[PDB]
Design a protein around this ligand. Structure first.
Ligand code: LL3
Ligand code: LL3
Lengths: 194, 194
């Protein structure tokens, strides 16, 4: 039941490391999970549904880690504050590269995946803008661009840049340089008078 | 011949405004171009080949405009220099939204389109890094991040941000705000000591 469903999810995540979702059959998933094909269909309507659940788990894990960070005070310089925040996403998605990659690809073909990604991007943009606004209210950051517009561009940069790095795309920032790269761009753009 | 090929390309660009390439038949393209289906196949092997040519034309048009800008001196403040450069791409791709949209989608399914996009991104990143390097050599910009890494993140931000704006994605920066938004992030990140 719960353990049969988890075994399907774990199998799917494992197989996605080696091949595209298109190259993975419902048969592969059932076999990996130690169940029959008809039993698989009790837990999931399709392999696409399995990917959606995997993506949902990872995105919620990132979101929850951001929430935990946000709850703490927690005495730090402004650059370190943003670095710790971006790190939540670097570590969470970077620890689930196969799911990250497959989930991004599915945005083109699945309305559910597209909606899921959109929902969480809006949430993360809103939180970013709220923190920028707080920084401005404090006198710590200058009142330059509309905070929400600035937040949107910075979050879209993170999406494209982190994911190109994880996929080893040509061009991409090396994974070992991408955190410092994004942090510099966030800090200078949020705190820079010009 | 040359005019038959141009009519196919123009027809394809027109139909892409209204529907996905998948919703456009070779029949539609031939009919729009005033030719038969077998005659279409003389000029192009597939509708995918038509999209590749459309994308190639637009990307080269942007690249050539950047070259022209780069040839001039041409007495300006640093913010305006970068604004004029980003504007080349905003105007070129923004004047061909349907081709831009379809070309980006085809990156997932066409190695030729993927390679084309990669080639020009590497070129634009290299040019960006060269200009940053020149600015540093001048004493105009500080020696912060590796120029090529900074250039890569800024160009990936432009790709994701411009194209989300043109597509009206949720989330996206409004098209009427995206130029100012990207310029601020470029200027602060290139010239900001922190
Ligand atoms: O990188 C992201 C989100 C993202 C990750 C991957 C792909 C697209 C978007 N963020 C969103 C939230 C942003 C943020 N951090 C914080 C805080 C950090 C520390 C205390 S609050 N507030 O907003 C950090 C960077
Ligand atoms: O926006 C882009 C490229 C791009 C556009 C869309 C999608 C992805 C990438 N660029 C690349 C070149 C960059 C640049 N401008 C210049 C100069 C401007 C004026 C004189 S040189 N040098 O590099 C401007 C911004």
């Amino acid at each position: 039941g719960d353990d049969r469903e988890l075994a399907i999810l774990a199998t799917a995540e494992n197989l996605l490391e080696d091949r595209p979702l298109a190259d993975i059959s419902v048969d592969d998933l059932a076999k990996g999970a130690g169940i029959s094909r008809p039993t698989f269909y009790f837990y999931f309507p399709s392999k696409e549904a399995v990917l959606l659940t995997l993506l949902d788990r990872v995105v919620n894990q990132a979101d929850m880690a951001l929430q935990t960070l946000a709850e703490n005070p927690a005495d730090t310089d402004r650059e370190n504050m943003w670095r710790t925040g971006i790190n939540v996403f670097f570590e969470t998605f970077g620890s689930h590269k196969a799911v990250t990659r497959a989930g991004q690809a599915a945005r083109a073909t699945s309305v559910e995946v597209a909606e899921l990604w959109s929902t969480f991007m809006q949430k993360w943009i809103a939180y970013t803008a709220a923190v920028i606004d707080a920084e401005r209210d404090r006198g710590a950051a200058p009142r330059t661009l509309p905070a929400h517009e600035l937040a949107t561009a910075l979050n879209l940069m993170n999406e494209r840049t982190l994911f190109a790095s994880f996929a080893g795309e040509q061009p991409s920032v090396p994974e070992a340089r991408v955190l410092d790269t994004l942090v510099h761009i966030w800090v200078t753009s949020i705190y820079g008078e010009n």
